[PDB]
UniProtKB/Swiss-Prot annotation:
Domain of life from the UniProt record: Bacteria
Similarity comment: Belongs to the ExeB/OutB/PulB family.
Main function: Out proteins are required for the translocation of pectate lyases and cellulases across the outer membrane.
Compartment(s): Cell inner membrane
Gene encoding the protein: outB
Protein name, per record: General secretion pathway protein B
Length: 84
C-alpha cells in the first residue's frame, strides 16, 4: 500500500506506512518496515528523521531534534509531529 517517501512541506513528514517491526534482545538485529523498506537503529529513512531506538512496543525517532514516537505498526498520517 505505500512505498517510498512522498514529498513533504519543510519540517513535515510524509505518510509513513509502518507495516512490520522485529524486536530482539540483540539491538543490531531489530528492524522496522517503513514505507516498504526495512530499517535499523541509526538509519535515517528521510531527512533528518533518524531511528534512535527500536523498542518492543514502539520506535523512538528524532525528527529535527525533537523526539517522535510511533507505536508498533502505528502509521503517521503525514504532517509536523507537532500539531495534529
Amino acid at each position: 500500500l505505500v512505498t517510498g517517501w512522498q514529498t513533504a512541506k519543510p519540517g513535515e513528514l510524509p505518510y509513513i506506512a509502518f507495516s512490520a517491526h522485529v524486536y530482539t534482545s540483540a539491538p543490531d538485529k531489530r528492524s522496522v518496515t517503513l514505507n516498504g523498506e526495512r530499517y535499523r537503529e541509526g538509519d535515517s529513512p528521510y531527512q533528518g528523521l533518524v531511528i534512535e531506538q527500536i523498542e518492543q512496543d514502539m520506535v523512538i525517532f528524532s525528527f529535527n531534534g525533537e523526539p517522535f514516537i510511533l507505536d508498533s505498526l502505528q502509521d503517521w498520517p503525514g504532517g509536523k509531529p507537532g500539531d495534529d
